[PDB]
Amino acid sequence: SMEQVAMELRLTELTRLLRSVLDQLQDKDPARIFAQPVSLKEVPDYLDHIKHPMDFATMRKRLEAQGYKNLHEFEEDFDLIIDNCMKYNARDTVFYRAAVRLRDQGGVVLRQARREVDSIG
Ligand SMILES: CC(=O)NCc1ccccn1
């Protein structure tokens, strides 16, 4: 149907916007601490602690399969990256501090992304 096509066009547009947001957020992780899933070989007990692992590579895979229907779903996954890290790692670690910095600096990006998704519809 024509409606379905229009829908898929919006989704494609959303994906374009979210790809930009994702690139901007990942730039706030220069150390690439969140680039890849935590290695279950190098951290074998990780899943005992964290029930829903997340990382930028996994987000990007979902993104390019057009797997985010709205900004909320994307933000959920971004928040998982940060929140998982701040649980697993202690306050005095380079990992925890990198999550804090990513969350702080990423807020600016997500604040404008929400305005853009709303405005463009
Ligand atoms: C993103 C994250 O939580 N990383 C923790 C970690 C991974 C490997 C070695 C030490 N610590």
UniProtKB/Swiss-Prot annotation:
Subcellular location: Nucleus; Chromosome
Highest taxon of the lineage: Eukaryota
Tissue: Highly expressed in testis.
Domain Bromo: start-end pairs: 9-113
Crosslink (Glycyl lysine isopeptide (Lys-Gly) (interchain with G-Cter in SUMO2)) position: 41
Oligomer status and interactors: Component of some HBO1 complex composed of KAT7/HBO1, MEAF6, ING4 and BRD1/BRPF2. Component of the MOZ/MORF complex composed at least of ING5, KAT6A, KAT6B, MEAF6 and one of BRPF1, BRD1/BRPF2 and BRPF3. Interacts (via PHD-type zinc finger domain) with unmodified histone H3. Interacts (via PWWP domain) with dimethylated and trimethylated 'Lys-79' on histone H3.
Role this protein plays: Scaffold subunit of various histone acetyltransferase (HAT) complexes, such as the MOZ/MORF and HBO1 complexes, that acts as a regulator of hematopoiesis. Plays a key role in HBO1 complex by directing KAT7/HBO1 specificity towards histone H3 'Lys-14' acetylation (H3K14ac), thereby promoting erythroid differentiation.
Protein known as: Bromodomain-containing protein 1
Lineage: Eukaryota, Metazoa, Chordata, Craniata, Vertebrata
